[PDB]
Design a protein around this motif. Structure first.
Motif, PDB file in Angstrom:
ATOM      1  N   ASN A  26     -16.923  34.679 -18.409  1.00  0.00           N
ATOM      2  CA  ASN A  26     -16.558  33.262 -18.421  1.00  0.00           C
ATOM      3  C   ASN A  26     -15.045  33.126 -18.596  1.00  0.00           C
ATOM      4  N   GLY A  27     -14.324  33.619 -17.592  1.00  0.00           N
ATOM      5  CA  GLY A  27     -12.877  33.553 -17.636  1.00  0.00           C
ATOM      6  C   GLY A  27     -12.376  32.123 -17.604  1.00  0.00           C
ATOM      7  N   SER A  28     -11.220  31.911 -18.230  1.00  0.00           N
ATOM      8  CA  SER A  28     -10.623  30.582 -18.323  1.00  0.00           C
ATOM      9  C   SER A  28     -10.096  30.205 -16.943  1.00  0.00           C
ATOM     10  N   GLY A  29     -11.001  29.694 -16.111  1.00  0.00           N
ATOM     11  CA  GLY A  29     -10.660  29.315 -14.754  1.00  0.00           C
ATOM     12  C   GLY A  29     -11.684  29.742 -13.722  1.00  0.00           C
ATOM     13  N   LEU A  30     -12.463  30.778 -14.030  1.00  0.00           N
ATOM     14  CA  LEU A  30     -13.470  31.281 -13.107  1.00  0.00           C
ATOM     15  C   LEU A  30     -14.622  31.881 -13.900  1.00  0.00           C
ATOM     16  N   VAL A  31     -15.843  31.666 -13.417  1.00  0.00           N
ATOM     17  CA  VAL A  31     -17.042  32.256 -13.999  1.00  0.00           C
ATOM     18  C   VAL A  31     -17.611  33.240 -12.988  1.00  0.00           C
ATOM     19  N   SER A  37      -3.238  36.462 -17.508  1.00  0.00           N
ATOM     20  CA  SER A  37      -2.787  35.161 -17.009  1.00  0.00           C
ATOM     21  C   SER A  37      -3.992  34.391 -16.475  1.00  0.00           C
ATOM     22  N   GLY A  38      -4.688  33.700 -17.374  1.00  0.00           N
ATOM     23  CA  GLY A  38      -5.767  32.817 -16.991  1.00  0.00           C
ATOM     24  C   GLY A  38      -5.260  31.497 -16.437  1.00  0.00           C
ATOM     25  N   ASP A  39      -6.186  30.546 -16.322  1.00  0.00           N
ATOM     26  CA  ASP A  39      -5.851  29.213 -15.839  1.00  0.00           C
ATOM     27  C   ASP A  39      -5.542  28.230 -16.961  1.00  0.00           C
ATOM     28  N   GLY A  40      -5.722  28.624 -18.221  1.00  0.00           N
ATOM     29  CA  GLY A  40      -5.374  27.747 -19.321  1.00  0.00           C
ATOM     30  C   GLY A  40      -4.335  28.322 -20.262  1.00  0.00           C
ATOM     31  N   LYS A  98       0.046  27.465  -3.452  1.00  0.00           N
ATOM     32  CA  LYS A  98       0.602  28.495  -4.326  1.00  0.00           C
ATOM     33  C   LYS A  98       0.016  29.864  -4.012  1.00  0.00           C
ATOM     34  N   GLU A  99      -1.273  29.908  -3.682  1.00  0.00           N
ATOM     35  CA  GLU A  99      -1.900  31.174  -3.326  1.00  0.00           C
ATOM     36  C   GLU A  99      -1.310  31.740  -2.042  1.00  0.00           C
ATOM     37  N   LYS A 100      -0.982  30.871  -1.087  1.00  0.00           N
ATOM     38  CA  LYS A 100      -0.587  31.342   0.237  1.00  0.00           C
ATOM     39  C   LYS A 100       0.915  31.598   0.361  1.00  0.00           C
ATOM     40  N   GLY A 137      -5.416  39.007 -14.066  1.00  0.00           N
ATOM     41  CA  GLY A 137      -5.722  37.604 -13.841  1.00  0.00           C
ATOM     42  C   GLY A 137      -5.732  37.267 -12.360  1.00  0.00           C
ATOM     43  N   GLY A 138      -6.334  36.118 -12.035  1.00  0.00           N
ATOM     44  CA  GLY A 138      -6.384  35.691 -10.644  1.00  0.00           C
ATOM     45  C   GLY A 138      -5.012  35.394 -10.070  1.00  0.00           C
ATOM     46  N   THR A 139      -4.100  34.896 -10.910  1.00  0.00           N
ATOM     47  CA  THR A 139      -2.750  34.588 -10.454  1.00  0.00           C
ATOM     48  C   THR A 139      -2.084  35.830  -9.886  1.00  0.00           C
ATOM     49  N   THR A 140      -2.389  36.995 -10.459  1.00  0.00           N
ATOM     50  CA  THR A 140      -1.756  38.239 -10.042  1.00  0.00           C
ATOM     51  C   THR A 140      -1.866  38.492  -8.544  1.00  0.00           C
ATOM     52  N   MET A 141      -2.756  37.787  -7.829  1.00  0.00           N
ATOM     53  CA  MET A 141      -2.741  37.935  -6.375  1.00  0.00           C
ATOM     54  C   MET A 141      -1.423  37.493  -5.744  1.00  0.00           C
ATOM     55  N   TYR A 142      -0.545  36.814  -6.487  1.00  0.00           N
ATOM     56  CA  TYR A 142       0.690  36.363  -5.870  1.00  0.00           C
ATOM     57  C   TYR A 142       1.670  37.532  -5.803  1.00  0.00           C
TER      58      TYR A 142
HETATM   59  N1  LIG Z   1      -7.624  34.835  -4.210  1.00  0.00           N
HETATM   60  C1  LIG Z   1      -6.700  34.291  -5.039  1.00  0.00           C
HETATM   61  N2  LIG Z   1      -5.381  34.355  -4.754  1.00  0.00           N
HETATM   62  C2  LIG Z   1      -4.454  33.818  -5.569  1.00  0.00           C
HETATM   63  N3  LIG Z   1      -4.745  33.182  -6.719  1.00  0.00           N
HETATM   64  C3  LIG Z   1      -6.029  33.040  -7.125  1.00  0.00           C
HETATM   65  C4  LIG Z   1      -7.101  33.604  -6.289  1.00  0.00           C
HETATM   66  N4  LIG Z   1      -8.261  33.333  -6.916  1.00  0.00           N
HETATM   67  C5  LIG Z   1      -7.959  32.658  -8.054  1.00  0.00           C
HETATM   68  N5  LIG Z   1      -6.629  32.488  -8.181  1.00  0.00           N
HETATM   69  C6  LIG Z   1      -5.956  31.791  -9.304  1.00  0.00           C
HETATM   70  O1  LIG Z   1      -6.447  32.300 -10.543  1.00  0.00           O
HETATM   71  C7  LIG Z   1      -6.659  31.230 -11.463  1.00  0.00           C
HETATM   72  C8  LIG Z   1      -7.875  31.528 -12.331  1.00  0.00           C
HETATM   73  O2  LIG Z   1      -7.565  32.621 -13.193  1.00  0.00           O
HETATM   74  P1  LIG Z   1      -8.736  33.540 -13.805  1.00  0.00           P
HETATM   75  O3  LIG Z   1      -8.849  34.777 -12.947  1.00  0.00           O
HETATM   76  O4  LIG Z   1      -9.954  32.676 -14.028  1.00  0.00           O
HETATM   77  O5  LIG Z   1      -8.142  33.985 -15.234  1.00  0.00           O
HETATM   78  P2  LIG Z   1      -8.939  35.014 -16.182  1.00  0.00           P
HETATM   79  O6  LIG Z   1      -8.528  36.373 -15.667  1.00  0.00           O
HETATM   80  O7  LIG Z   1      -8.439  34.696 -17.570  1.00  0.00           O
HETATM   81  O8  LIG Z   1     -10.393  34.680 -15.951  1.00  0.00           O
HETATM   82  C9  LIG Z   1      -6.833  29.968 -10.634  1.00  0.00           C
HETATM   83  O9  LIG Z   1      -6.096  28.888 -11.213  1.00  0.00           O
HETATM   84  C10 LIG Z   1      -6.272  30.302  -9.265  1.00  0.00           C
HETATM   85  O10 LIG Z   1      -5.080  29.551  -9.022  1.00  0.00           O
END
Ligand SMILES: Nc1ncnc2c1ncn2[C@@H]1O[C@H](COP(=O)(O)OP(=O)(O)O)[C@@H](O)[C@H]1O
Ligand SMILES: Nc1ncnc2c1ncn2[C@@H]1O[C@H](COP(=O)(O)OP(=O)(O)O)[C@@H](O)[C@H]1O
Ligand SMILES: Nc1ncnc2c1ncn2[C@@H]1O[C@H](COP(=O)(O)OP(=O)(O)O)[C@@H](O)[C@H]1O
Ligand SMILES: [Mg+2]
Ligand SMILES: [Mg+2]
Ligand SMILES: [Mg+2]
Lengths: 375, 57, 52, 57, 375, 375
Positions: free
Chosen positions: A12-17, A155-158, A213-215, A301-306
């Motif tokens: 249950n990540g802060s931003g994605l489940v 780096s979560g979403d909160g 931001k993702e792209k 974290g998901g942000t790390t895709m940048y």
């Molecule tokens: N494929 C992706 N490419 C770039 N950014 C993404 C992608 N998927 C999710 N994100 C970013 O990751 C954030 C969610 O972070 P999350 O992975 O839930 O943090 P945690 O690792 O604490 O669970 C979202 O706000 C979104 O902007």
């Protein structure tokens, strides 16, 4: 459902489940943590007329729903929302009953102890999970990296958390939480786009701009020099095709958005950039191992895709710290699933069932037992 | 067909990443060995100079 | 020195192998299955219901 | 989507393959340097020990 | 300004600056050592737009300023900050010119000799003080107690020092500095309050929580038994009214915060509690006088306004040391001013002007003269 | 293990343990006497989670462990610690079983007789060594020098002992122990470095500063004149590269640290310098042989690797004693192993097995038999 009684693994990540079964390589049901509620009342009939909308259903129905966040920076609004989304995940998305599978959950770093006690109590009463375990996402990302030494930047979403762990030992004295995250990124980008002529407030455009931001977003190598050369920058300026079809062009903003985490003074934070937070974190602990921390930093974290976090990270740390030893970052592709992978790793070994939090322990000591059973 | 091809390409990533990481492990091994060798050589040279001075005196 | 290197690399390889075990268990049953839309040409035009 | 993914994976193929080959080259360089360093260390040990025996005399 | 050329008495304590005239009973200008700077840049006009903010002005303007500490645990950041705050103290707060009054200053125990040489040199060049003397705060607290035998526990805001002095003789061989102080207390309380649901990072809440420590905190007589009975503890649990008006309730934390100095393993220090540091200090010196040290221990500092240090102190020392002789602590009320009082005491007697550090001695031998003129 | 039943030779020197087989030239397993223990409790799994850490393992894991000394100045804390470290030495480091090899051990001079009785009893019960012999390190260093006449200065890490032996005969009436050793050196250097701006308390920095003592330290030929010329001393001032990479510069401190043993009044000892302790020791015995003692002085210990002890020694003794006869010191390179070498020498000759302390003698007369079997 598998014939075996293998455990459930849910991040249950802060931003994605991200939820699935133990022994699996990737979570099966992955959805963002947005929740949509009917914007108006019911007069029509024949279809719909359902309160809670979660997952891709709400993603498709974003325009008609007030989009609300049951969790923001760890704070919990309404446990009923988690009840419904977990029901949806377990039965409509995972097609699994929690009666026959213990659950391994991951929680945001430094989450409230009262939050843990209430969530565990409502969970145990509402659901019939046989056994329980909850862990910090920091050690999960560590497990995904499979190296006991390093400092984890979650780096979560909160929240963004910096946590040092040396030889598989947590260092809470050198752990910090920063209130900069995706929300801030979207906000700052919203105000800059407002200064670009496009002013929106609703959440659909929030998702559109986080997709931008993702792209397209950059992490500037040198900031003011890149806006100076981005004055005209016909080639460097980049455009996006919004789903309605209009072409929206953005230039320096691409690298002026993530820069704010590095330069918080743009929108007024006393705390300096996150590299300073990793730096202070490092020096708080004994001097000697600090070099290893420099050489073993991990980001998750998901942000790390940048792009751009790695080069900026190393250059600034080398600027702050002596440049004798070489600093290198490690970040496996698709690391936002990595935490869930680590959960599966926890269920791999046969010692994990020695400390399942069973029903009878909770029935004996109430929720308070977790205070002695996890830590 | 395309998605299957993308999956085999993903397996390519995995195995080539494994090659890179085993190489990097060997890099750390041999570079540490080089530090140790050079440090021992320098210490031995300094000891040789000191014992030559002692012999002269 | 060789002992130090062996110990470090052995710990690293042990964590690597434990990580591989999860992938070895399953690799495809995590993805969802196919349900693309296609065909349906033979279906009739006057639907038994009036949403026709 | 599949085509762009495949092309991205091709770019990765070449990048990582080159990285690995470069590492192998570095391996060979480090190997020959380590052999030379070990030779020099043995030389210095022998020299120092001979000087020490002469000193004792 | 008094018609007489009496000396200035200034205690630059690690956490508070207390300045006034010689022959006075209490310092006239007393302010905390926080320094505020403009959080943003200047665009407005008509008022304000001033860089340095010190004293009660910064206390009122805490929210708008980045709050920074020119000194932390003795380490000096920027001498310009001391220059400005001393200007403010002398002219805006003391309404005195340092040209006509020699200055007696107190310094933190075991302060750097290089720090002393640089601070004295910048002082003499920038200011026009006729004469100088600087002393350790330990002997000042001794003078306030007026008893030549005892071990001084100086609990400042950056360091806690244990210094034994027998018959008015310093024992540097048995003097130690511990990095636990108010900063640590606030930090630990911050993390516990984070686990209570309230997570703040900024300095305003730092001052709020140190105020909470001043008002409500306990020193537990027995630790784990008191959390065991503090499980519910409706009566024992205590509340505070924060200036915004919300009621924040704290229970065991009241006595779980100061306990960390006694139990450093909570946040990871190799050094044991400060009572162990007084114990080792005592045994380092000859056996015989140790009993007198047991019976003549003194404690000094602003923290000492809290309850519970005395009972805990005596009980643990009696547990560690044989219980034949009776151990009793002495601590006069409002002892944080006591050091400054001792400064006045130094100016009371007519021998003190035999060793004023005059301008011409510094002009002859540079700063190095202090190496021979104080010690 | 060698096919022959040759004896074990183990020097448990106060600061270093050096163990090996009889007939060998140098000890095989040599490690410092530090012992590391987990600084925190266990929650993680998959690796580590071991209590005692000894040898190079603890050296690598210094940061994570509380570093404790099972022996300090001869005093024994916990026999279990010696049990574990001897287990490690015999099986993990020497790869030998003590069942088939008698042990020759060396003990610190004037060690407690009760200490000997308890250590021998726990040894015999816990282990299955066939036979025993324990000797003072003084005669061992004598054997390494191979000259029956001389005064031995044993400079361990806990005590410095001066012992005169004429024509291979111990003189306990003229033997003294001084509480100055490596510990004091590190302490004094710690306080001076604190006055230089760097203040550390933990043991990792203790090892760093003792390494600095090993590398850069001087023994001043003339003390106050060398600080007078070391005021600036750009060339004479020397720097070190700490493993983190910072360059730490030290000047007069290099020769102001070992000077404290020569000048104990710096940190308050009634006893004068160790040269006075050798002087008094010499005169306590008959006048005539004193000249030979002057000409046959030997120094032993790991500290002896430092420069400057020889010149200082001779000059001060010549200042104190008449300068007719020429005084010369002898000190073979790598003499910290010399004691162990002497142990091998003891096993070299065939008379040594006449007085092995066998199991049955201890079973008959208890530990008390050693009171009649060694002396
Ligand atoms: N494929 C992706 N490419 C770039 N950014 C993404 C992608 N998927 C999710 N994100 C970013 O990751 C954030 C969610 O972070 P999350 O992975 O839930 O943090 P945690 O690792 O604490 O669970 C979202 O706000 C979104 O902007
Ligand atoms: N009236 C008070 N009651 C309780 N605590 C106080 C009071 N005034 C100051 N303090 C505490 O004392 C600390 C400052 O210590 P200080 O007296 O400056 O040390 P020193 O004696 O070394 O100068 C502050 O952090 C504050 O928390
Ligand atoms: N190679 C070295 N160079 C300089 N000093 C050393 C060296 N090795 C050990 N020492 C010093 O020797 C001390 C240990 O003394 P030790 O030889 O154990 O005394 P003993 O001879 O009584 O066993 C340590 O504190 C360390 O500082
Ligand atoms: Mg995250
Ligand atoms: Mg104080
Ligand atoms: Mg010795």
């Amino acid at each position: 459902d598998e014939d075996e009684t293998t455990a459930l693994v849910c991040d249950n990540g802060s931003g994605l489940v991200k939820a699935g079964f133990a022994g699996d390589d990737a979570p099966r049901a992955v959805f963002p943590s947005i929740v949509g509620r009917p914007r108006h009342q019911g007069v029509m009939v024949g279809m719909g007329q359902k309160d809670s909308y979660v997952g891709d259903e709400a993603q498709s129905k974003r325009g008609i729903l007030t989009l609300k966040y049951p969790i923001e920076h760890g704070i919990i609004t309404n446990w009923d929302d988690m009840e419904k989304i977990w029901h949806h995940t377990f039965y409509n998305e995972l097609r699994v009953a929690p009666e026959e599978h213990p659950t391994l959950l991951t929680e945001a770093p430094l989450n409230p102890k009262a939050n843990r006690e209430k969530m565990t109590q409502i969970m145990f009463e509402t659901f019939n999970v046989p056994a329980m375990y909850v862990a910090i996402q920091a050690v999960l990302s560590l497990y995904a990296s499979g190296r006991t030494t390093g400092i984890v930047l979650d780096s979560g979403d909160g929240v963004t958390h910096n946590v040092p762990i040396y030889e598989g030992y947590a260092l809470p004295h050198a752990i910090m939480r920063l209130d900069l995250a995706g929300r801030d990124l979207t906000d700052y980008l919203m105000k800059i786009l407002t200064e670009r002529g496009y002013s929106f407030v609703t959440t659909a455009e929030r998702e559109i701009v986080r997709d931008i931001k993702e792209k397209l977003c950059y992490v500037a190598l040198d900031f003011e020099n890149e806006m100076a050369t981005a004055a005209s920058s016909s080639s460097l300026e980049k455009s996006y095709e919004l789903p309605d079809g209009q072409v929206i062009t953005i230039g320096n903003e691409r690298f002026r958005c993530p820069e704010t985490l590095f330069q918080p003074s743009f929108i007024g934070m006393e705390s300096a950039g996150i590299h300073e937070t990793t730096y202070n974190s490092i020096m708080k602990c004994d001097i000697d191992i600090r070099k290893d921390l420099y050489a073993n930093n991990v980001m998750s974290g998901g942000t790390t895709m940048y792009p751009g976090i790695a080069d900026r990270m190393q250059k600034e740390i080398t600027a702050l710290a002596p440049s004798t030893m070489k600093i290198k970052i490690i970040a496996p592709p698709e690391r936002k699933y990595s935490v869930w992978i680590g959960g599966s790793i926890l269920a791999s070994l046969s010692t994990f069932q020695q400390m399942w939090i069973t029903k009878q322990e909770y029935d004996e000591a109430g929720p308070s037992i977790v205070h002695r059973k996890c830590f | 067909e395309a998605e299957k091809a993308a999956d085999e390409s993903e397996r390519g990533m995995k195995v080539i990443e494994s090659r890179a990481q085993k190489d990097e492990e060997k890099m750390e091994i041999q570079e540490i060995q080089l530090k140790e060798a050079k440090h021992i050589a320098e210490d031995a040279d300094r000891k040789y100079e000191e014992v030559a001075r002692k012999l002269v005196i | 020195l060789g002992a130090r290197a062996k110990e470090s690399l052995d710990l690293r390889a042990h964590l690597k192998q434990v990580k591989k075990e999860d992938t070895e268990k399953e690799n495809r049953e995590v993805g969802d299955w196919r349900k693309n839309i296609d065909a349906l040409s033979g279906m009739e035009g006057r639907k038994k219901k009036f949403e026709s």
